[PDB]
Design a protein around this ligand. Structure first.
Ligand code: WN1
Length: 460
């Protein structure tokens, strides 16, 4: 029974509005409704993994698990296994997998982050799950960010707190936050970004939605504009939105957007918005393709509609050779030529690199680089031909070309990371000097760049 090189992953996000679900929610898991929808010919084909994020979820874990499992069994005739479930307040994540994957999944981690302080601590935050699927690390974050049209900067702060403090994946990757720990990271939820148009334009917006003319609304979506200005979700992807705003609906129909200010809303307007989103970040040159992104039309218990997204994702096998794991394979090596980091810092410490990868027995520290002044007032840290030659555990090109090297640039004075990035070993050639590049981030914000050349030797 061969190991897969691709799986499909379902991501759902639904703010349930503190109401129980209706009796049938199968349209969610079938990717049916509005937007990029899934072909009917696929309806009986199970996804490999289903990841369900809820917000304002009034159910117990038991109650929701029974609904989810019975839903999937009705669609697919497969009894899914529970990988993980984690709840913070009314924010919940469930991961389900096909039974054949049970002995492919390991290293399951869960965590949560509470956002805000005093007044604003007690209902917003995030839950997440990570695990290994054979040779591939997968991370999932469901966040409920701060509400309100005039709080986009609070949402951006909530995002940075969540990616700093959510503790998932391999704890040995100590310089790296969740935006670097996984082959594939999916981040979804009620992100609560709004369409920033004047309150007076509400009925005009409703008109546009009825005409399925979303362009002049999406051009004011706060998440798209904040991402374009590099204020949040740097280096994440989102499929194009082709479904109507998923908030704020009158319950029990989808015919009416309920936008006007009410005591129940704190006298705030809720113009129709794409609150409910799915984004992802995968390591460079790993296969990931969005195959659906949309909202359901027939689940109407909440003031939000559920959102679905599905992905093809590349995965790798748990490789054994006669040498590694448990030793190096001296037929393999990774060399860095002519490498330099460009950093936005004002600091004048010396810096060194750490190279982290599951193709190494343990991380590798470099010598300190040579600091120079860049012509536009930047710090350039030169490593020259000084970088340590990396010794992978396995030399087989079928394994090595699928790997990645995480790089942290650290202060010699404080040992704190000033920037993190990732290099793919999926090269155009072996035994050949080839350009490499990554942006560097810290706390998910841009801090610099790392560039140079690589020379990869495999057994072939
Ligand atoms: C379906 O694949 C796997 C693979 C490895 C471990 C598990 C697992 O431990 N599941 C579980 C057990 C008790 C409580 C909650 C759970 F989610 C599941």
């Amino acid at each position: 029974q061969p190991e897969p090189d691709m799986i499909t992953i379902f991501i759902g996000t639904w703010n349930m509005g503190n109401a129980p679900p209706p009796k049938k929610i199968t349209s969610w898991f079938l990717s049916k409704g509005q937007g990029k929808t899934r072909d009917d010919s696929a309806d009986y084909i199970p996804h490999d993994i289903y990841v369900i994020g809820t917000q304002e979820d009034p159910l117990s874990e038991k109650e929701w698990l029974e609904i989810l499992k019975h839903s999937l069994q009705e669609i697919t005739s497969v009894t899914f296994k529970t990988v993980a479930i984690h709840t913070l307040w009314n924010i919940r994540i469930v991961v389900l997998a096909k039974p054949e994957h049970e002995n492919r999944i390991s290293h399951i981690c869960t965590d949560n982050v509470k956002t805000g302080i005093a007044n604003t601590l007690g209902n917003k935050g995030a839950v997440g799950v990570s695990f290994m699927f054979n040779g591939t690390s997968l991370g999932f974050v469901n966040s409920h960010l701060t509400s309100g049209s005039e709080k986009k900067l609070r949402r951006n702060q909530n995002y940075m707190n969540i990616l700093r403090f959510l503790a998932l994946g391999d704890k040995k990757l100590s310089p790296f936050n969740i935006t670097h720990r996984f082959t594939h990271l999916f981040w979804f939820g009620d992100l609560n970004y709004r369409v920033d148009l004047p309150t007076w334009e509400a009925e005009t917006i409703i008109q546009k939605i009825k005409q399925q003319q979303y362009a002049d609304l999406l051009s004011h979506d706060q998440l798209l504009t904040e991402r374009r200005e590099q204020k949040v979700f740097l280096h994440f992807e989102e499929e194009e939105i082709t479904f109507a705003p998923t908030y704020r609906f009158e319950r029990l129909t989808r015919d009416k957007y309920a936008y006007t200010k009410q005591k129940a809303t704190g006298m705030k307007y809720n113009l129709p918005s794409w609150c409910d989103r799915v984004l992802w970040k995968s390591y460079p040159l790993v296969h990931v393709v969005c195959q659906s992104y949309g909202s359901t039309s027939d689940i109407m218990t909440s003031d939000h509609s559920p959102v679905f997204a599905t992905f093809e994702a590349g995965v790798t096998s748990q490789f054994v050779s006669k040498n590694g794991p448990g030793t190096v394979d001296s037929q393999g090596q990774i060399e860095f030529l002519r490498c330099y980091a460009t950093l936005k810092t004002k600091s004048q410490t010396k810096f060194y690199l750490e190279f982290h990868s599951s193709c190494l027995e343990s991380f590798v520290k470099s010598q300190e680089g040579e600091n120079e002044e860049g012509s536009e007032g930047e710090l350039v840290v030169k490593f020259g031909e000084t970088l340590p030659k990396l010794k992978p555990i396995i030399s087989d090109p079928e394994y090595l070309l699928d790997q990645h090297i995480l790089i942290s640039i650290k202060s010699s004075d404080s040992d704190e990371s000033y920037g993190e990035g990732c290099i793919a070993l999926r090269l155009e050639a072996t035994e050949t000097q080839l350009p490499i590049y990554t942006p560097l981030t810290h706390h998910g914000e841009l801090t610099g760049h790392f560039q140079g050349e690589i020379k990869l030797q495999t057994s072939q």
